[PDB]
Structure formats: structure tokens, C-alpha cells
């Protein structure tokens, strides 16, 4: 429940928090592409 005019975005608001984590994740993807 965000202000009425934002109704459209509950979907994203929903995900935004996962991102932080996502970074430690990516950090690996790159390290892998760069053969350690």
C-alpha cells in the first residue's frame, strides 16, 4: 500500500530490495569471466 497514484508499481516496489544481494552475486559473474 503506497500512495494511490502509485498503484501501478506495487510490482517493482516488491522487488527493489532483492538488489543489494544481487551485487555480491554479480561480483562473481565478472570474476568468472575474468578467469580469477
Amino acid at each position: 500500500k503506497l500512495p494511490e497514484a502509485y498503484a501501478i508499481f506495487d510490482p517493482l516496489v516488491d522487488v527493489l530490495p532483492v538488489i543489494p544481494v544481487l551485487f555480491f552475486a554479480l561480483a562473481f559473474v565478472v570474476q568468472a569471466a575474468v578467469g580469477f
Partner: peptide
């Protein structure tokens, strides 16, 4: 409802930078 599809894109946003970087060059 939709929430899932829109999460998908952001998630594959990061490995895509790795890809767009593979092809072009730099970083190294």
C-alpha cells in the same frame, strides 16, 4: 500480479553488462 516479469529484466540486467563488455573490450 505482474511483479515477476518486471523482476526478470532487472535480474538479467547485470550479466548483460558483462556480455556487452565481453564483445566490446576493456575492463582488462
Amino acid at each position: 500480479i505482474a511483479q515477476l516479469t518486471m523482476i526478470a529484466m532487472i535480474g538479467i540486467a547485470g550479466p548483460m553488462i558483462i556480455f556487452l563488455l565481453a564483445v566490446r573490450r576493456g575492463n582488462l
